[PDB]
Design a protein around this ligand. Sequence first.
Ligand SMILES: [Mg+2]
Ligand SMILES: [Mg+2]
Ligand SMILES: [Mg+2]
Ligand SMILES: [Mg+2]
Ligand SMILES: [Mg+2]
Ligand SMILES: [Mg+2]
Ligand SMILES: [Mg+2]
Ligand SMILES: [Mg+2]
Ligand SMILES: [Mg+2]
Ligand SMILES: [Mg+2]
Ligand SMILES: [Mg+2]
Ligand SMILES: [Mg+2]
Ligand SMILES: [Mg+2]
Ligand SMILES: [Mg+2]
Ligand SMILES: [Mg+2]
Ligand SMILES: [Mg+2]
Ligand SMILES: [Mg+2]
Ligand SMILES: [Mg+2]
Ligand SMILES: [Mg+2]
Ligand SMILES: [Mg+2]
Ligand SMILES: [Mg+2]
Ligand SMILES: [Mg+2]
Lengths: 203, 52, 90, 38, 210
Amino acid sequence: GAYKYIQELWRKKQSDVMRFLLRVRCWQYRQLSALHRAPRPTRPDKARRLGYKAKQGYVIYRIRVRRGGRKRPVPKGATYGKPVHHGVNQLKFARSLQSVAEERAGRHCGALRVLNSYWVGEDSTYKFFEVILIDPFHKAIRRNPDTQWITKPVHKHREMRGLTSAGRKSRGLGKGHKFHHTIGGSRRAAWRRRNTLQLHRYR
Amino acid sequence: PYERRAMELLKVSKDKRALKFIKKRVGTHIRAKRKREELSSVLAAMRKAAAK
Amino acid sequence: LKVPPAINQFTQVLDRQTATQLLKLAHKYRPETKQEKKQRLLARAEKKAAKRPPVLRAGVNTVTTLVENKKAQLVVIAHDVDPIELVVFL
Amino acid sequence: SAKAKRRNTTGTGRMRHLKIVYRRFRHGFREGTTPKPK
Amino acid sequence: APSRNGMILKPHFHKDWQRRVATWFNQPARKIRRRKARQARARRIAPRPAAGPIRPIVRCPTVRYHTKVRAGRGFSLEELRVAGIHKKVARTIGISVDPRRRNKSTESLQANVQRLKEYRSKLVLFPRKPSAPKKGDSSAEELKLATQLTGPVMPIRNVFKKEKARVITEEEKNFKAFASLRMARANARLFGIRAKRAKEAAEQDVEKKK
RNA sequence: CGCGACCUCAGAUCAGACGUGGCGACCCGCUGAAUUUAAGCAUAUUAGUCAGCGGAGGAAAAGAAACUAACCAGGAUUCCCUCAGUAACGGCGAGUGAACAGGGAAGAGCCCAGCGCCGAAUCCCCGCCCCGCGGCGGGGCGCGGGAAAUGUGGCGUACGGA
RNA sequence: UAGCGGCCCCCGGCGCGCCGGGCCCGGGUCUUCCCGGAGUCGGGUUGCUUGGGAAUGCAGCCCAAAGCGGGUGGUAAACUC
Ligand SMILES: [Mg+2]
Ligand SMILES: [Mg+2]
Ligand SMILES: [Mg+2]
Ligand SMILES: [Mg+2]
Ligand SMILES: [Mg+2]
Ligand SMILES: [Mg+2]
Ligand SMILES: [Mg+2]
Ligand SMILES: [Mg+2]
Ligand SMILES: [Mg+2]
Ligand SMILES: [Mg+2]
Ligand SMILES: [Mg+2]
Ligand SMILES: [Mg+2]
Ligand SMILES: [Mg+2]
Ligand SMILES: [Mg+2]
Ligand SMILES: [Mg+2]
Ligand SMILES: [Mg+2]
Ligand SMILES: [Mg+2]
Ligand SMILES: [Mg+2]
Ligand SMILES: [Mg+2]
Ligand SMILES: [Mg+2]
Ligand SMILES: [Mg+2]
Ligand SMILES: [Mg+2]
């Protein structure tokens, strides 16, 4: 099946041919606007692996992200305080740029509902992404029981709570000795549980 | 391109610096080793085609 | 730009006169329209009351599987698909 | 300013719709019917 | 400011602890809400066993505890395969399952098999449709006697075998424990070097001799 | 040139739909201080805390192993007791500080893509007719209209399977 | 107020008898075939954070893989089971 061929091809990203195609895309998108709807998927494989289904009610939004770190938002240097917290320029934001992209699209298209994302290309200044969105009221989705879990009102704005593939990684959850701080629901609830006194009746 | 260049080193018989070069880019010894043996075998295929 | 040969190859295209003959052939072995489908199944219902011929085969995944199966003698392709990665290897 | 919060909240005003929603919930949001006349 | 004598100690009352205190005046009511939900469940699923499905015998890990026995997750796939039960049906009559478990020891696998056999014997199975009893079903007396089993079904009791008063041979008198111990620890420790010095001495002897 | 397929992109008070704010005790994701302690202070501590911003539910989040172990082995998650003020971190000063095994509450497991078989066997909407209609559905009929080979449905998913 | 005390309305709850549709699936045996998710793992490097100390986790830049393969086995490394 061709898709398996497609897969190892897109893994051959260093090859001269793939390099050429991505190079042309990156030029093309740089000249287009920073956020717009693609009519069909750029990567059919990535979409099928992730969940995309050639049916009504699926949309794909291309978005351009500016690259680099996070300098502290402050007037001059003048971070008033101690020389420990003087640090400011070479600081790095905890979440990726990929989740940032997802966040911006989801907030713009509020009615829609964010499934997942994949990479397409990059310059120095910019990365590029393809965000898969869904309409939760078209009957194609409502009646199909595999998908009607998204229609439920809990999953509003998933990207904002970090339940997307990117959001799960920032939470630091995992099994084993490498992921002890999250035991419990999250990093926050761990701290709560360890730093509470249980004053009993009987003591 | 790096694989091509490491091949040209295997042609000029500098197997240690070629290994060094791969280890420098890719990192570990095992991955570099298995990649090197593959590149030697394809050069063997060139030896076969020149033979027959 | 300096275009690599594996893409340049699509510029070599089939001539007008031979292509018309190809379409002349497929016109004989066209797949059935929807309305004829209801009427053939209706006649088949009559068959129920009382072998498919060869046809074209569509879809890349179909084509390639039955290429591995070495059944197809002739493979036609379109030159102007928007992401080329689909067909390149074929 | 928690005191500023309490100066301006839901309990304060009418809540002319919201107080009666509590009442409708009390009877499971019954609708369109009536009882039988005498 | 320490006067003459005490335990030097580091108490952790620097964080804002008086905020996050969990008081336990709930307790008695919580006990009741559990008790009520348990009685209502047993009232719902009336004749099925209250505790749930039977769970298998398992050896404990860690040198400390490996004498004990517990309940596990569920019966293994080999125990089922060998007793001759489709796993999904086994699922349906209230038998605990977990597939992930391996089975290295023969005594465990085999004893778990025995345990299922007694269960499979005792089980009083009802028809799907009452009108037509089937082959794999229970008799009318059995349906009459069916009733809830209170408590954990087939309780795990750790038995100990009694050894009668033996006569001691003088050989048994002779055997030397302590020496055998310190000796065996030493051979295990030094095992690798005996081979290293042996390879070096044989390799040097062969090059020097030949 | 003119006409016709597609592709890409606009405008419509187009026909039908949805978002937009509030509350914010409890929850989730970010950003993120100093008073103060050390008899001083600058690393540490205070603290991933107050304050700022966004998003939710009657609960949320979590979750069915890229696991623990290294014993004759255990077997999703969540919560309680104990392991423990321990192993470890630290101007080795001040102080900080877990987990696994064990006994308990509750106890339920599953699904795609792919790889492959099947005349696309799939779907949505209009129109017409019958029933029912205060959680807008069941059925029958249209050379009625589109979606879909850049892959729709059935079987089936690592416990192997056809 | 007590009482397995009474009466009257609405809503639900388990049962029974019948209509109009859909679903036509299994248990074993032997023979032949089939089987996996990349800018992701991993490495160097910087800064924060964590009890994690030749770097526990997270992120940014740069490099950039494999298929009897890969990760883990709490002191870096090579060989090895
Ligand atoms: Mg942070
Ligand atoms: Mg004293
Ligand atoms: Mg209970
Ligand atoms: Mg309108
Ligand atoms: Mg609100
Ligand atoms: Mg001080
Ligand atoms: Mg002072
Ligand atoms: Mg001072
Ligand atoms: Mg800190
Ligand atoms: Mg701390
Ligand atoms: Mg609500
Ligand atoms: Mg949830
Ligand atoms: Mg989760
Ligand atoms: Mg999981
Ligand atoms: Mg453990
Ligand atoms: Mg499934
Ligand atoms: Mg399915
Ligand atoms: Mg599929
Ligand atoms: Mg009374
Ligand atoms: Mg720190
Ligand atoms: Mg990362
Ligand atoms: Mg260690």
